Design a protein around this ligand. Structure first.
Ligand SMILES: CC(=O)N[C@H]1[C@H](O[C@@H]2[C@H](O[C@]3(C(=O)O)C[C@H](O)[C@@H](NC(C)=O)[C@H]([C@H](O)[C@H](O)CO)O3)[C@@H](O)[C@H](O[C@H]3[C@H](O)[C@@H](O)[C@H](O)O[C@@H]3CO)O[C@@H]2CO)O[C@H](CO)[C@H](O)[C@@H]1O
Ligand SMILES: CC(=O)N[C@H]1[C@H](O[C@@H]2[C@H](O[C@]3(C(=O)O)C[C@H](O)[C@@H](NC(C)=O)[C@H]([C@H](O)[C@H](O)CO)O3)[C@@H](O)[C@H](O[C@H]3[C@H](O)[C@@H](O)[C@H](O)O[C@@H]3CO)O[C@@H]2CO)O[C@H](CO)[C@H](O)[C@@H]1O
Ligand SMILES: CC(=O)N[C@H]1[C@H](O[C@@H]2[C@H](O[C@]3(C(=O)O)C[C@H](O)[C@@H](NC(C)=O)[C@H]([C@H](O)[C@H](O)CO)O3)[C@@H](O)[C@H](O)O[C@@H]2CO)O[C@H](CO)[C@H](O)[C@@H]1O
Ligand code: K
Ligand code: K
Ligand code: K
Ligand code: K
Ligand code: K
Ligand code: K
Ligand code: K
Lengths: 257, 257, 258, 258, 258
């Protein structure tokens, strides 16, 4: 794939604008955006989380106008949608002290997004190799104790929505040359969410040679995780809470050989 | 079609004003404060009182009558007014320990401002779709479980002061081409306020093509939220505390086709 | 005044170097730099802080070499909080953080503020609680109404007197102050750790977007400061604000005006 | 070595891509990436940590294509911590943060460190407590004296063996290492939250102020790392260090030397 | 001194490389790098710290190659705290953070400070409490008055002796020190986590706004440091300051003066 000149003319550009909903587990008909309450196994070997307790990666494959030319992704604007929902501190949460407001959403967060010309490539890593991941999820198979640090057998494509659990997969840094990805894990049970919004910020997707992701088969791949923290119920039980992510991507036509 | 800027001394003007916060104002003595926060007994029964809900602030400022020319907003200076009030730790708050001073205002904050040539466009998102928002507020209608992450039916304009609750609306990232907005949510009950003031900092409002918000009908729209945290009363009850926001906007005349 | 050219050559520049002591309340002959211990009113309506419990803005007016139209124009500032290491005294009748521990250090709500101007800093009054009774001997927002809790434009003043304007009820007026440059940070929370940087290598430029610094009316330079570092906790649990002095070095040049 | 011109042409560049596994102690066949539970000595004098309780430096010596005078010069690095999302497993024999809550996540003291060099990382020994008896199967500061608690120039070593040099008693020697680029952050405190960023868009340039990167003696590239992310607390409250692997991609070019 | 041109040629540059050990109090033969456990006086007036409980500034005077009019001009600095990983020893007679947990790590109030000059660092005395009795064997502000708690211009000194000038009662004098560059951060709070960065890729330029570095009078370079990292808590709860050494590498060039 030798990359040649960019096309010009009114017809040579296009935009993709959409949102990815979060996939936190959705334990019942009222709990879109939440996981099942989190329970703790008594031993490493008995860790067997329910599917509805596991946040998963979000992904959308977006068809582009049919076109050798390829759409090249050049810029991104992105935003977490609904940040102010975390100000609801009145909905049967757990009072921080006698007569106080409910404890707000807080604790471990993972905020991640990617834009590529093909599926995000994943490497499996597990906290505990004896965790049994549930039916309906796609997970590192044949996990060994080495899978707790690095097992090169665990290679996958993020090719299905609400299927790849966040905790056992990361972007594969050995691959992904045709994707740009960005993430932050902020740990701790008390860490405060810090969520910025603005319509004035643009990320340039071009690599060090001036080339953006090139869309194979005229498809653009967007992926996201926005686990904002956990909601604490009055009882003390805790559920992951997630939010949607907005994407606006500008593309141009690029000739290749 | 945006054409050239008009020059000459007659071609520039300035807007200077402040927006007061709209925190709920539960009685005649409590401007700047919400009603004390109560917690529902069940998730489904969440039903906040109007005076417990901080709302977006908005001001529409009339500009010198033109006429096609339009005022174009170019720069902003902005500041929270009265940051030092949070040093009042002697006004029947809750002692941090025996014989100590009162706990200062702290916890969840939302600091937000926008400048636009028309009303800020809003997208509704709710923490809990079974929350009953109260009479006298404008809130996402026909909320469903999908409203907890993204329901595109919930579109609105910030066109009325003390009416749109902060917790269920955000700037719509799919619109707002003629507005510049900026916000930060910092969550957590112990989050310290960090408030900077200076008259030496300017934000440039021009987009990537060198064009600022263009003021339709010669009106400038300013919006803000500055929920600084919660004040904790001696009894333990907690009220949101907000402050006013200063705006200085410089505008120039722009020809459009 | 139209601002014309800068004057060059011998005697066309000068420097001001000084320090401003903090005004925290000074409740007795031994307690310069501290406030009185903070007490809490029994009701919201009855808030009535004693003068010696209220930190105040510091101000100094510095006479410049007499001119004459030429005016002194403030171009750069170096500034520093003086005595930052005093906060390492954790052995002087404080409250142990746990059994056998060192004393809790100074921490909690801070306000670090400084300004340089060619005239008095202009202030806007805002009060946490409009029914607070501010004490005799302080200058405070008069005829406060419930609107004063958010913004009452009647409360305009000049920082024209030292140890008089309480920090908690006045801020720089952003609608004025065109001939002053001001900078401040409020960091709230009872446990916030002080973070205090010192260096003699950092310079702030005071020139506005047109290349013009504060122009000193009557050949006087106005310097203002607040450096409430936090609270000291006594063994008994009582808390006192603690402040430190601020150093200023300002370079000025002569500017012709019409 | 006098440094002369860079070689050009298709054959003049090469790249190294690999990962280094963490070496946290691996106390049993199920606990790769963890240390043994941390125990506390009764006295300073009796401090005597078992090997499987001591995280160690990771190192790989990577042979490069043979050249011989030309040397491979390391010019850029991309690096990443692998498996950051594993820390979201808060359902696996941990300790509930409060009644009915999720498990306490990995948190507390972290050290994130990496280096790229044309020879082994040079180390200086420094010990918290000179009376610590370091265990069989580790390489540690020898003939430690009280001065070893601050600086004893006898403790010089090379990071030349994997899972051997304990993190707590060795640092990069700032008096040497001119042919290595190293970077590290120790973030202390028992409750500090991990903050782990990932991206494939960030490059670090390895060139010094003269435009010269590490030069690979004998055509070997030396990569070193520590990524102690914090401690995992199990249900009983016992704590174990948890580490993760680090990815490296290094671009190199041929450089002539005399 | 009128500053004229820089000398060039291979012989016109030199380097100083060294380390300064911390001076934390060293209460016994086994506790180099630590202070005595911290105690708390029963009244503000009775504060009377023992010498071994007080960290002091470190200083080294480094002779340079003899010149005479030429002076050595300090141009760049690389500096690093040595032994950051020692803070990973959480198994040595500390206090478990909770049942079965590891020892609480070094944390709480830190002061990290360094300076490079062509003469002794100039100090200003400021005291937390003017009634503190500083011990024999230290050099401290004399004839302290209540004003010494904020600024008493009598307390001027030179940092001209090791193990002598307590950190808590002296700071760099911002009204002087024109021939020195100094940098420091006080981070307060009993639970503040240490954040210690190491790298050999970072250089600080020591030139002022006129392109002139410190000029070394009598061909001596003066380096000063404080690196109080926090406090170590022993099993009983008693707390001691812990410090680490600091590396300095300074590049100098010959400068003609009149
Ligand atoms: C306290 C408890 O039993 N927790 C169970 C959980 O039980 C459900 C519900 O508990 C809560 C909770 O965890 O505190 C109430 C809370 O308001 C809910 N929050 C939200 C945002 O929806 C959560 C949440 O739905 C789940 O945790 C998600 O997994 O649920 C109980 O109050 C409820 O109690 C019923 C009794 O079981 C029943 O005998 C009696 O007739 O009626 C009461 C009241 O309805 O039961 C709920 C389950 O049916 O269930 C989860 C299962 O995922 C766990 O077992 C928790 O431990
Ligand atoms: C303690 C309590 O009853 N709290 C009620 C609250 O009652 C009001 C007031 O309480 C406080 C409080 O919440 O602690 C006192 C506090 O100083 C106030 N703070 C400020 C900044 O104004 C708050 C605040 O105004 C409200 O929380 C705002 O929503 O209010 C009580 O002290 C007061 O008690 C009176 C009795 O009602 C009355 O029978 C008796 O004769 O006199 C006492 C003393 O005046 O009543 C206040 C209400 O009238 O009310 C709120 C609802 O607004 C909640 O019900 C709290 O739970
Ligand atoms: C314990 C007590 O009675 N406190 C009241 C106080 O009495 C003081 C003094 O108490 C202390 C205190 O704990 O508040 C002792 C402290 O060491 C001292 N600290 C410093 C830095 O000076 C403080 C301080 O002087 C005041 O709090 C400043 O306002 O005082 C107590 O030991 C002694 O018996 O009487 C003293 C009064 O002369 O007084 C304050 C107001 O002045 C309050 O009334 C306290 O409740
Ligand atoms: K299992
Ligand atoms: K309801
Ligand atoms: K009153
Ligand atoms: K031993
Ligand atoms: K060296
Ligand atoms: K004394
Ligand atoms: K001076």
């Amino acid at each position: 794939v030798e990359v040649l000149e960019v096309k010009t003319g009114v017809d040579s550009i296009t935009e993709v604008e959409c949102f990815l909903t979060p996939e936190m587990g959705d334990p019942d008909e009222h709990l879109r955006g939440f996981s099942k309450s989190i329970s703790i196994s008594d031993t490493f070997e008995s860790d067997s989380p329910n599917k509805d307790m596991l946040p998963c990666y979000s992904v959308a494959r977006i068809p582009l106008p049919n076109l050798i030319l390829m759409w090249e992704a050049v810029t991104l604007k992105t935003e977490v949608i609904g940040v102010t929902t975390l100000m609801n501190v009145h909905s049967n949460g757990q009072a921080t002290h006698d007569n106080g407001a409910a404890k707000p959403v807080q604790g471990t967060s993972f905020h991640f997004f990617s834009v590529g010309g093909e599926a995000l490539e994943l490497q499996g890593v597990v906290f505990n190799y004896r965790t049994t991941y549930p039916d309906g999820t796609i997970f590192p198979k044949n996990a060994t104790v080495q899978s707790q640090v690095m097992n090169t057998e665990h290679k996958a494509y993020l090719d299905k929505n609400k299927a790849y659990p966040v905790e056992c997969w990361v972007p594969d840094p050995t691959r992904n040359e045709n994707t740009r990805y960005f993430g932050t894990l902020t740990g701790g049970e008390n860490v405060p969410p810090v969520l910025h919004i603005t319509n004035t910020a643009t990320t340039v997707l071009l690599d060090e040679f001036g080339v953006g992701p090139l869309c194979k088969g005229d498809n653009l791949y967007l992926s996201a995780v926005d686990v904002c923290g956990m909601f604490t119920n009055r009882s003390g039980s805790q559920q992951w809470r997630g939010l949607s992510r907005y994407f606006k991507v500008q593309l141009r036509k690029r000739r290749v050989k």
